[PDB]
Each structure stands twice: as structure tokens, then as C-alpha cells.
Amino acid sequence: TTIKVPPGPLGYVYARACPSEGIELLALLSARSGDSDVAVAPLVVGLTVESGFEANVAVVVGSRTTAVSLKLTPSHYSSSVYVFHGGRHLDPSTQAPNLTRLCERARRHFGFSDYTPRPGDLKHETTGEALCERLGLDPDRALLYLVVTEGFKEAVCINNTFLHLGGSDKVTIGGAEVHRIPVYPLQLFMPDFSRVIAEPFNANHRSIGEKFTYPLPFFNRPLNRLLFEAVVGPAAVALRSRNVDAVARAAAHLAFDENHEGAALPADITFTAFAGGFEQRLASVMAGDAALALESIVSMAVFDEPPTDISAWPLFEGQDTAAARANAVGAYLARAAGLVGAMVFSTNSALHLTEVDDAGPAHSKPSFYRFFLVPGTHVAANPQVDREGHVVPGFEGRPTAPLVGGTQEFAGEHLAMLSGFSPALLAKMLFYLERCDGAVIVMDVFRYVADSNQTDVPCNLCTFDTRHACVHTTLMRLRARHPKFASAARGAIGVFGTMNSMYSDCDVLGNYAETYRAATERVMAELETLQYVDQAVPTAMGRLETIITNREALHTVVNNVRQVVDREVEQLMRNLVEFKFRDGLGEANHAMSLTLDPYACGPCPLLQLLGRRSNLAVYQDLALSQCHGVFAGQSVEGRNFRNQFQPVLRRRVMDMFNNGFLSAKTLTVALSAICAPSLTAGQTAPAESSFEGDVARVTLGFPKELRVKSRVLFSAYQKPDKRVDILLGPLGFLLKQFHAAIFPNGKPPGSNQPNPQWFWTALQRNQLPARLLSREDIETIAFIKKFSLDYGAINFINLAPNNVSELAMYYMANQILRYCDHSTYFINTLTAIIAGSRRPPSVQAAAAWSAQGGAGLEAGARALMDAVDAHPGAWTSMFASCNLLRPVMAARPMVVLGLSISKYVFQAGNWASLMGGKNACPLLIFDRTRKFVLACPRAGFVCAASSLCEQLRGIISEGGAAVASSVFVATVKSLGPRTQQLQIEDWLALLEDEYLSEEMMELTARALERGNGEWSTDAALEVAHEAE
């Protein structure tokens, strides 16, 4: 009907004493640069917040007149907290030195502004030390961090917030005591004020309510600096707005004034140089706002996923006794490294698409592809031009690099930009980059460092003793993967997201629907019964090493899968008839959704940045596709065209909700006795529970997920006419693996080792040594050849099955296609690149972690490897391919893939591909008949892994007057006529209720009278179900 959400502050400042154990773990999940006392850590119940922590909340944003009532706006807590005091207690994500310095100069190189606290405000700063004093904590054995709602983190750093020192309380995290001071909006003291406050320290501002006791803004430098860098920066870069402070204020504007449409980004935002190019520029700011606005919507929304709880992470199970549970976490994050690697080296990654290009119209005709994002990491140095294409001020002189080609440079400065010029985040970036380059086609770190002493190094960030971990070195090691932007045409976006749905359509034939999904499930069930497979690990042999011991076993296994598949297909199709076959499959496509839920992201500020950046790109893309229609037949050069039409661009975007690509939902907020600071007693006095107010806007409408789909059925999909080699055929994997068992005396002349390669080669050319084949081998070879021939005749999946799981699904798919008379072309396939991890495969891979870096570098490395177990963060990414997605998606994984949005006014998220070839990922193969996904499992690590007495005795609980009826049904829908066998004892067990059991006994009896003495229906359900 209507959803509820508790009124609360916009955030809290958590303060606790330095824990002394699970810190090493917290650090791994966190992001922290070794040269700074600040850090950003993930929001994790039991780690950074107490257990009853409630993410969704209606924050007190202001006050109204008519007596003063409060204003509340819903929002949720940001997926990560911000440590502004105590970062020193967290091991740096990297040994990389002077990241703070590197960011500083990189920021100046690309034209972005730096955090600059006003001199006249310092006297009002609230220092960590100061708070530690009030809280009675040791300034050197203490941690202070901000826990905020997504909608006001920006409000905090522009000093539009204040601490309610009187509302202090304590909570427990892991048995430890933790203090927390609630944070509120200064606007509270300004009735009917929805604007951002400039000069928040002016206690005499006219908008302040009279006789009110204006509080002291909560101004902390380390904090404000970290937010600017870790929260405002990424957006600043993403929405190409070099005046960072301005960006922060634009977000605050959207958070304080729900009714705000029109311009938000600075009115004088500049533009990277590379009628006239006037519209191009305009389309970018408008899309820029479009995106900033859309993201705000999602920030003021309320999602269903709860904040992660470390004590729920199956990742610890068993390997969690010793404090060396840290390894589990270390090995986990290492997998992700492989994904972040792709997000940095894919030439079309969201992290790079920061500029917009005008391809011109296709003259009033639609132009949904005129404007689009292009990579601009290599051009962020070009001159900044204004609205009218004129260079601004300090940009005169700068060389303007070309958008395509040219000899590009990808140095530390750039890496820093991708991470919003935040050294804290950049650190976590390197942490992952350091776990990358699972190269097998190619640098000697040790040799490099050695031959570099006092040799004049091109880097003023490191020294001989630190070269092993310095950015420049790491980038040197990954040089081959560096992004070379050479494409000029509009491309797909390389997004990082997490498919958190319990449901997906990535079966070999996608969503072709009993339904097709059901069938594949039963077959997989059946195969598991035969013990030929492990539904969760397709790659598993599951008892096959035992079953297949004689060539007669082969016969039976092949016949069983063939048989169970034919049986289930025979059924599914027959049912579908009792639907249009030919038309139905040419329509079905593979599908998956990417959540926009802030708590479905990984437990790391970096993995979070990636998702946030991705979504921003996706929003701009959408905004962009509507710009041309917005300009059409309008004097587009008007002084403030932006404020005049943004409202429209905005609306055209909102219109996309539930229209093909953007899945959206609506929530109605229930109105109302409210505890909140006193508008008079001061921020020190206790909370005033007198206030009674509601939510300004009762209706919430926001994006929920991204619908990505890829057409299954289809030039290059032409099934070659040539026959397939038996060894590369449907049974190739089995024949090779169990050759010795099937063909015992199958070893060649000379060797005493049964070699399948040799055997089947000679067997197929007649070059097989005269009369070798047993009397019974011929029957098997025959059997083999026929299956291979039959399957081949109907096969349209251009991939060789690698295990029984795939063998059954492909065969089943091929059988369904044969039923529909499919012909000529191969179908489209999906391949997952599973992200895994392992201990460093060499000393080389540990270079950057050696504790000794000078002449003792290579020894330090070796020592590190010698005691690998002691280093919980000493892991490395590796990849594995999988052509069976069902299991993959079951793990509700974090993913990285190419996404191309088409707008025809519907939207469709076309599954595209990552550019940069093997550089984005070495396992990526160019082939237009297949699509890929880099995937890192979640379920089984940071999520629960992939019961009637319960369901029944669950209805007996949350149930009304028809419990009897409801329960009878469930029992029947879980037991056929079996229900009739149940005696009073059986019932009393299924329901620990005597009354109910007797009722069940009366029902069961009546249903028998209906069938005259032959069980069947439950019309008696509805009949009794009358108690209304």
C-alpha cells in the first residue's frame, strides 16, 4: 500500500578506539594511501556499523512555517564510510609513494581545481583531536569516520551540515564500543529554505528562523578534503566539470530542492577543445546535468538490498578460525583485480568515455546516435574553450591532442584522473592493478630497479628504495596493456556492475519460453541424479572417473544424457502446443539485469567507484540520445537555453522508465512525534521530540535496474559445410579424457601408452595399424561416429562441448532448433570469463610487496613468497572461461561487459563487447557469433550460497482466517494423493497445532467424498476458504 521509513539525521560521525585484530581485514576491504591519515572504507554491518543499522531513512532536511514543522526526504546510506582521522591504522592499499603529490600535479595538468578551505573559516573548524577530547579518546589510538546518506555527502563538504553534539549515543560493533554524533542540515534553522547555503557561518542570515539559535557548521578539513577527492572528484571528471567545488554545489542543489529542474552544473563550465561545434558542447552539459540529476533520483531512493554483514559472508566458513580469515578476503579481492584491470585497459571503458562527439544528423529526421560519449582520457590536457568555442585563460599555449590516433601517453597522472584525483582511491586502484597482467604472450622488475640507481629516473615520486611499488613502475610493467584510443565512431560502453537478480535468462537459448528454463533444470537435475554432473561446477567430473571404466560405460553415459534430453524436449515441445515455434525462437534473446542498488556493489570503495562511473556513463548516453530532438527547431544559442530546456531533456529521460532498458519502480511514502535537534536550546542540549512533520513529496519514482539483452538467433554465422573431426566433435572431450578406459590396447606401434590424438587421427585416415581394433572396439568406434554424425547434422552451436553439462545443453538446444526446422546459421553464444585468484605464480609478481626495496629487493620478494601465508593480501588474479552461464549468474556476480544502448521511443540494452582486444582481457576472442562477460562470483563469498514443515508452519504464523484452507493447498501442491496417507500424527508433525491437524483430517476426508473415493482435486479448498 504505502512504504514506511524512519525519520533520521542525514548522517553520523562514528568515533571509536583503534580496534586490534580485524583491522588487517578492514584495511584489505578499504582504500588508503600510505602518505595520508584519511581512508575510505565500505559500509559493512559488523565492521563499520552496528547490527540494527537501517540503510533506508527519511532525513530531516529543513523546516516549514504554519509554529515550525520538519521536512523529511527519503534516502539511503552511502555504500562506503569516510575515515577522516585514523587512516594511519589501516595498512596502505599500496606501498606506492607520494600519491597525494601525484594527484596534486596531475590535477593541475588537466585543469581541475583543488580543495581550498577559506582562511576565515579555519577558526571554526572542528578537529579530530577536538572530538576525540569530547569523546575521551586517544587521538593516536582512534578512528573517526562519516556515515552519510547518498543524498547529502556533498552537502557535508560544503559546510552545510552541523553536529548535534547533544544527540550523542553509543552502539556496539564486534563487541567494541563506538561513539556516534548525529549530523543534520543547517537549513533546519531556516524555515522554508530549499537552497544550498553559501557562508554557512553567518549566524545573522535573514532566512534563519527568528529566536532560533543557529548552530556551528560542522567544518572539518581532512573530511572535506576527502569528500572532494573521493566523492565529488569522480563526478567532476565524469561530467567534465573542472571546477570541482561547483560540482559539489550542484549535487547539493538537487538534494535540497526536489522541485529543481534546469541547469545545475556551473553556468560557465568550460569545454575540452579537439553553428560550429556549438551544439556538440551544449549537448554535453545538458547531458551532464541530465546524468547528475538522474543519479540524484537514485540517491533519494530506497532499495531492498541490505548492507553487507561480515558475519554472513560464507567466505569465512571454516577458513575463519584464526585471524587469518584475512586471507579469504585477500584472495577474494584479488579476483576482482582482474575485473578492474579490464575497466582500466578497455579502450571503451566507462572510465574513459568522458568527452562527447557530434556526428551530425542522419534534417529534422530522428538522430538518436548523433551525440555520444567517446574516450577523452588522452585529451583532458587540451585547451578549455567556453560556450562559444573560445579558449579561456590559462589554457592559451597548451597543445591540442587529436581525439583519434597520435602518440598517446598513459602515465600515473591519468590513472589518478580515472580515480577522481583521489589519492585515497587511486591507492586501491593500484592494489588491483598490481594483481594484474596474467600475460602469456609477452618485464624484469628486479632488473629494472637495479639498473636504475642514480641513473636519473623520469619520476619525482619514488626513490631507489621504493621503485618496486611506484606507480610509474607498475605502469611500466603493464605498458603493453595501455589504452590506445584509435576508434572515431560511436562505440559501446564498458560497464562494471553487479547482476544481483535471483533470475536471469542466459540458458543456451536464452528466454525461449512447462518453460524452457524448467526443462533445462530438470535435465540438469536428472544428470545430477545419474551422478554425471555437479550443477554448480559444470567443469566437474562428478563420479565420471568411476562410471566410465570400460567402453561399455561410455555407451551407457552417452545414451543416458541423449535419452534424458530427448525425453524432456519431447515433453516441453508437446506442452507448448497444447505458441508459435518458428516465430518464437527468432524472438527470444539472452538476458540479464544490472542493479542500481547501492548495496549490490562489491565491499570496496574502488569496486564501487567503477559501478558509479559506469552508471553515470549510461545515464549520459541516454540523455545524449534525446538532445537532438530537444534542439530541433529552436534558437539553440539563447543566452540561457540550458535553464529553458533542461526541464524537457530531463522529462524525456524520465520517460524511459520501464520502457525497454531502464527498469523503474514507484513507491508511495506514508505520512504521519519526531525527535530532532532543538531550534532554540542549541546543538548541545538534547533532542527535541516535539516536532511533527511529513515528507514533501509522497511519491518516489526511480530507476531500479538495467535490462541488458542479446538476440539469440541471427555472413559469418554460416555453418561451414565441412564435417567436424570426431576429436573436436560432441564427444571429443570424453574420448580424449577416457581414452585409456575405452580403447585399452589403443596405443600406437612403438608406444605402450594409449594416445587418443594419435589413435583417432590414424583411425580417421585409415592409417591405423592393420587389425588392431578389437572385435568390440569397432562397435564402439561405430557408436561414437554415429553420435558425432547425428549431433553434427543438427548442431548449430559453433562450440565444442567441454563437459557433460555443456554436451547436454547444446544437444538439447540443437534438438529444439531441429524441431523448429532451424537452418544455415550458427546461433549466438555467451561466454563467461570467471575471475579467480591464487598465490603469486613467481617471485616477480611479488616485487611490489617486498618489505625490502633497495639492493635487498629481490631477496625481499623471495622472503615474501617463502612466507606467503603470513601475507593475506598476497594473491593474484587468473582467468577461466565458461560457456555455460546459468551457474555463473547463479552467483549473482559483479560483471564487466560492453553495453550498447539503442533507442528506436523504446530502449534496448544490447550486449556488446570490450574494446582493446586481449588488452582488456587476454581471454577475449574476436568472433561476431559470441559475446563475453568478465565475472566475479558473490554468492558463496559475500552473499548467501546459491523445508515444508517450515512453509506450512510459516503460513500458520503470518496468516488470517483461512489458515486451514491455505495450508491444505500447500500440502497438496507438495504431495499428490500422498496427502491421503497422512494420518493425524503426520499432520501434527507438519503443523505443531492439534486443531489445524484435525481440520486437515476433515478436509482430506471431504476431498475424498468429492472424488467418490479417488483423490484428485481441492475444490474443497475454495469452498472452506469461504470464512470471509
Ligand SMILES: [Hg+2]
Ligand atoms: Hg591500536
Ligand SMILES: [Hg+2]
Ligand atoms: Hg528524543
Ligand SMILES: [Hg+2]
Ligand atoms: Hg562455470
Ligand SMILES: [Hg+2]
Ligand atoms: Hg579477464
Ligand SMILES: [Zn+2]
Ligand atoms: Zn616512480
